[PDB]
Design a protein around this ligand. Structure first.
Ligand SMILES: Nc1nc2c(ncn2[C@@H]2O[C@H](COP(=O)(O)OP(=O)(O)NP(=O)(O)O)[C@@H](O)[C@H]2O)c(=O)[nH]1
Lengths: 307, 300, 548
């Protein structure tokens, strides 16, 4: 349930990398200024994606004075970002995370608090395990006594520019409110006449994307599909939509296939308005119309027909 | 392909500090702008051969930039180093302060290449403009333009601007290659015939292993200069991403609202992309025209 | 690839060899008559129905190869191992390749020596010589003229017993080395006389002030000379033992002399091993074609204690990083009640250190009595502290004759962690395409470019014997001098190196650099020829390979 807001550890120094994250995602999150509201489960979350402002990041000097305004911002679904950095300013902030979280869980029904472990580049294979044991040791007496405080302890893989924040951000939007397990297992039924390895449901260029049945297995395929959507969108962006039609006008009749050596094809096809689908495919020779395109056409019709 | 295996010679020199061997190492070893922080100090001289679409092979010399190494270039074995030189690239830092010693080395290098090469050419390249605001980037590049046009008086030079975190690097070395290429007019004529009888928006042909913009033809002149740079950067980023998957690319297709672009192998070391001015056509046209193109280029 | 074994009834050894897919036994062979008198006497005619035809994948986990009378750089050892991937062997075969020859020896599977067997790609071969170049440094002190238990001088024990045994074993295993026999010792308070000034040195201690004059003497006996029929050196060493105290006491400077200081109190030991390294670094200068292995043996009557400066010990660690050649043996006997090779530091709790690079061995004499005491006695008239030396257990150390008669060359394959990040912040790649030519001009371009033979990294050679006054004791050499300055440098601060040398067709050699360990990876002359040659030239100097 993201009403995600940006609270690092210092206003003038963490906002460098926080603003790199902002200009990494939010130039395609900022479509939601006048798009819509009030109807969906992610529209409030996208309006929170819009309101990525800043505050005073150690807030325990003023536990009352700013909080008033964002009291409203922390009523109804409930999330807030938090950083676990590399240097020795981790244990005192890790102690006062309870100070940051107490008002939060007392002011709002069931929240999930996004403590990301972030930019500790230079971790060994056992040292990352013992620094995980650090938060396992000093995050016990705040979790085992609360009640309705939902915490998300995520571990970014600690480099400068890795893709390993937004599969966990995909997990938190899976944890938003899935009204679609019927759509999940019916989509598993739709990959029965398919190249059944990966069928990722995508939305528009905003870099949050949902997934079923195939995320962590045997390869980070979420990395290659992110590269896929970034390549096709950056081709279509100013090389494809500068001459006729504005760049804000998406309306994409864009399909894209990528072949590779062992007869393996990447496949993006998308309705013009908001929905998209990348369904990869194995060593198969589709020169027909009775196997793939007919039934895939039928359930892209269905996936546009659902909501 | 007629394999006239010549052997060209190209030196890369300048002052130490910023971006001497980093740009070579990201353009011929599949690196990124982040992982080039680990190259560090070079030595006096190190060189390489790189093969490039078959016949042409580059002796690429990388020269260091300490005081003793430049002195041991100029007042020493100079006659061996500056002999049979075709292409010189001379690197300019922006942030560096000792401009007097830089232009002093530049004057000595121009006089030495004049007394040891009559028909070589010099490209000077001001890199690392990623730290200065864009209006001051315009001012600094125009000042380097005029000052280097003055001080490069008896023999001409070509001065370009670049950084590592963008695609003007790919434009500048595309220019180096297109000057350094042997043949022009037959490939232009096949390019023009292909593009004017299969009516495309624009056609683009490239080397495979490094993807520098070899040749191009358009009929919709509404993209200014930055189309080639951008598409080269993003698909070589995609090739770097697919590099960790033990698989080659060789083929792709995309179409959109008013857009139809396709990429494939042409020959032993060449990529093609094309956007075809008619977005509502399936892959039958790409089939019959890769047939139509490989009947001709595999007579070349 | 077929394997044929052939015993007879109850031959307790066996025999086996190779062919290619034998099934019907139409064809037999004669290739060797020697192996009959080498193993067992019988005359097997064409088919006596005993010849077993079996695949029998039985390997020979470690096989030894001895050399004689030649000179073989370690790239040629790599070529022999590359040619010895998938064959058979037996005891005392003469393996040949391209004018290079070795004799097979002491082939083991995991506990037991096998008469014959099969070698396939995963067993390890180890090279040894009987034609090595060997230095013998005899350290003299005041304990040579001191008695021990059983009634002897330690000198007489050392020379008579140990050298008689070593020369008898050198005759028995039929080896032929090139030796030095160098005597060395120290004296105290030999301050100054008429123009004997750059010979002295002056020792001191920081934490408690102590500074004295001392002087180092080397007297050599036969310098570089191979000959059979030894033990004449034993007579000359007896002559020099009797002539030695006047020969060391009453020379160059005459204050009040104190001869031949104690090993457990002072000593020029670490400087002697460092000067042997100062010899062995310049092996490429005048190259004998009749020697392969390198060996430096120090015979001491010491206990195992040495009081050694910090800088020389760290420097010789960094120099035995390159070419490990040092062996120590003690003819004092009396294996003490602690970890016996140890150094008390002498830096400018008593700071201990224990070496794990050295190969120490004791020499017990030959007699039988009741309770061999481990103590001397002499009656006067009148934060961490993480190594101590006493909680380390130590039963007995032998002599290790096999590492003193057939010297072992340095290995080929060692396992170590990869080149990740952090400290070694420097990698450099050079991809060098190769144009074949039919006109000698192709290896050296890559060679002078990609390394300049450790043009990147330094050779840590900080010890320079700049002076040596000599003395007119006779027609051998006799240098008696001071070591001179020691211009030590630290290792490469905050960066090691590693390199990626590519062949642009399909080939990669990944060099690491803390000791030159490689990883070769594949994907007129041919490509593989130049690739193999370049791996051999990286192999010649420091040549470890990673594996798995
Ligand atoms: N962020 C950034 N870093 C740069 C840029 N240009 C160069 N650098 C940094 O400069 C460093 C030096 O690389 P380089 O100049 O090629 O090394 P070199 O000069 O050949 N070594 P030597 O001094 O021995 O000749 C690289 O690590 C690279 O990270 C730039 O535009 N942006």
């Amino acid at each position: 349930k993201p009403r995600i807001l940006l609270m690092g550890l210092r206003r003038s120094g963490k906002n460098s990398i926080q603003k790199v994250v902002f200009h990494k995602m939010s130039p395609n999150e900022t479509l939601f200024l006048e798009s819509t509201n009030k109807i969906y489960k992610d529209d409030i979350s996208n309006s929170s994606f819009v309101n990525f402002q800043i505050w005073d990041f150690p807030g325990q000097m003023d536990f009352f004075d700013p909080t008033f305004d964002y009291e409203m911002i922390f009523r109804g679904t409930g999330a807030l970002i938090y950083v676990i950095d590399a240097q020795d300013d981790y244990m005192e902030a890790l102690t006062r995370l309870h100070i940051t979280v107490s008002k939060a869980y007392k002011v709002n029904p069931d929240m999930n608090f996004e403590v990301f472990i972030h930019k500790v580049d230079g971790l060994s294979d056992d040292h990352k395990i013992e620094t995980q044991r650090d938060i396992h040791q000093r995050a016990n007496d705040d979790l085992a006594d609360a009640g309705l405080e939902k915490l998300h302890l995520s571990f970014y893989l600690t480099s400068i520019y890795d893709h390993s924040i937004f599969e966990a951000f995909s997990k938190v939007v899976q944890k938003l409110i899935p009204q679609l397990p019927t759509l999940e297992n019916l989509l598993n039924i739709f990959i029965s006449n398919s190249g059944i390895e990966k069928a990722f449901l995508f939305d528009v260029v905003s870099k949050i994307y949902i997934a079923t049945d195939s995320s962590p297995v045997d390869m980070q395929s979420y990395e290659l599909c992110c590269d896929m959507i970034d390549v096709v969108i950056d081709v279509s962006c100013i090389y494809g939509l500068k001459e006729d039609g504005s760049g804000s006008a998406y309306d994409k009749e864009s399909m894209a296939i990528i072949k590779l050596n062992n007869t393996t094809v990447l496949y993006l096809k998308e309705v013009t308005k908001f929905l998209a689908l990348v369904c990869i495919l194995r060593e198969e020779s589709f020169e027909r119309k009775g196997l793939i395109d007919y039934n895939f056409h039928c359930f892209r019709k269905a996936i546009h027909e659902v909501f | 392909m007629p394999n006239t295996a010549m052997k060209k010679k190209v030196l890369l020199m300048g002052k130490s500090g910023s971006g001497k061997t980093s740009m070579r190492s990201i353009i011929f070893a599949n690196y990124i702008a982040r992982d080039t922080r680990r190259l560090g100090a070079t030595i006096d001289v190190e060189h390489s051969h790189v093969r490039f679409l078959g016949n042409l092979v580059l002796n690429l010399w990388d020269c260091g930039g300490q005081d003793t190494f430049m002195e041991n270039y100029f007042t020493s074995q100079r006659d061996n180093i500056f002999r049979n030189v075709e292409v010189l690239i001379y690197v300019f830092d922006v942030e560096s302060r000792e401009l007097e010693k830089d232009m002093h080395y530049y004057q000595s290098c121009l006089e030495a290449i004049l007394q040891n090469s009559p028909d070589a050419k010099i490209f000077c390249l001001v890199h690392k403009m990623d730290l200065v605001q864009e209006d001051q980037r315009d001012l600094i590049f125009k000042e380097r333009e005029e000052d280097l046009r003055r001080l490069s008086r008896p023999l001409e030079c070509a001065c370009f601007r670049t950084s590592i975190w963008d695609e003007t690097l790919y434009k500048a070395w595309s220019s180096i290659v297109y000057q350094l290429i042997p043949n022009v007019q037959q490939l232009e004529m096949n390019l023009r015939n292909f593009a004017q009888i299969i009516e495309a928006d624009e056609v683009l042909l490239f080397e495979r292993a490094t993807f520098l913009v070899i040749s191009h033809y358009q009929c919709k002149e509404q993209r200014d200069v930055h189309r080639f740079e951008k598409i080269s950067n993003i698909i070589k980023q995609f090739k770097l991403s697919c590099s960790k998957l033990a698989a080659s690319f060789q083929s792709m297709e995309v179409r959109n609202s008013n857009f139809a672009a396709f990429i494939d192998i042409f020959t032993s070391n060449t990529y093609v992309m094309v956007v075809m001015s008619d977005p509502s056509i399936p892959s039958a046209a790409t089939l019959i025209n890769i047939r139509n193109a490989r009947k001709h280029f595999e007579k070349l | 690839i077929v394997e044929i074994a052939h015993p007879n009834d109850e031959y307790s050894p066996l025999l086996l060899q190779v062919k290619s897919l034998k099934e019907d036994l139409q064809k037999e062979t004669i290739s060797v008559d020697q192996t009959v008198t080498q193993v067992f006497r019988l005359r097997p005619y064409q088919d006596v129905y005993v010849n077993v035809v079996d695949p029998k994948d039985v390997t020979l986990d470690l096989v030894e190869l001895t050399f004689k009378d030649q000179y073989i750089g370690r790239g040629d050892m790599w070529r022999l191992k590359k040619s010895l991937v998938s064959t058979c062997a037996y005891i005392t075969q003469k393996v040949e390749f391209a004018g290079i020859r070795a004799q097979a020896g002491e082939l083991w599977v995991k506990n037991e020596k096998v008469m014959c067997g099969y070698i396939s790609e995963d067993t390890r071969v180890v090279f040894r010589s009987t034609s090595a170049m060997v230095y013998i440094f005899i350290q003299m002190s005041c304990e040579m003229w001191d008695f021990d238990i059983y009634g002897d001088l330690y000198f007489e024990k050392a020379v008579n017993g140990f050298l008689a045994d070593l020369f008898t074993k050198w005759k028995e295993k039929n080896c032929s080395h090139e030796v030095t026999v160098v005597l060395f010792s120290r004296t105290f308070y030999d301050a100054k006389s008429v123009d004997e000034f750059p010979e002295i040195n002056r020792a001191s201690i920081r934490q408690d002030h102590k500074g004295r004059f001392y002087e180092d003497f080397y007297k050599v006996v036969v310098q570089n000379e191979r000959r059979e029929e030894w033990t004449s050196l034993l007579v000359t060493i007896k002559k020099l033992f009797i002539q030695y105290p006047v020969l060391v006491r009453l020379e160059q400077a005459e204050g009040f002399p104190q001869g031949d200081n104690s090993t457990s109190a002072q000593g020029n030991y670490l400087e002697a091993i460092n000067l042997s390294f100062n010899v062995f670094d310049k092996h490429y200068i005048n190259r004998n074609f009749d020697r392969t292995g390198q060996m430096s043996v120090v015979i001491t009557p010491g206990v195992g204690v040495f009081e050694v400066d910090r800088l020389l010990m760290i420097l010789t660690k960094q120099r035995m990083i390159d070419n490990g050649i040092g062996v120590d043996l003690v003819c004092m006997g009396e294996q003490p009640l602690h970890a016996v090779p140890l150094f008390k530091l002498h830096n400018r709790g008593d700071d201990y250190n224990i070496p794990h690079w050295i190969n120490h061995s004791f020499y017990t004499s030959k007699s039988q009595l009741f309770c061999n005491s481990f103590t001397p006695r002499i009656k006067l008239a009148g934060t961490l502290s993480a190594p101590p030396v006493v909680p380390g257990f130590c039963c007995t150390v032998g002599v290790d004759w096999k590492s003193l008669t057939t010297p072992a060359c340095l290995p080929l394959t060692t396992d170590y962690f990869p080149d990740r990040q952090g400290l070694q912040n420097d990698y450099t790649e050079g991809c060098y395409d190769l144009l074949p030519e039919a006109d000698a001009q192709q290896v050296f371009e890559e060679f002078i470019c990609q390394r300049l033979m450790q043009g990147y990294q330094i050779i840590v050679q900080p010890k320079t014997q700049k002076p040596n006054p000599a003395v007119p004791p006779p027609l051998s050499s006799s240098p008696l001098y001071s070591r001179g300055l020691v211009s030590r440098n630290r290792p490469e601060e905050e960066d090691q190196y590693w390199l990626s040398m590519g062949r642009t067709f399909h080939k990669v050699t990944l060099k690491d650099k803390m000791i030159t360990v490689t990883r070769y990876l594949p994907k007129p002359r041919a490509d593989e020829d130049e690739w193999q040659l370049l791996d051999g030239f990286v192999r010649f100097v420091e040549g470890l390979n990673r594996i798995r």
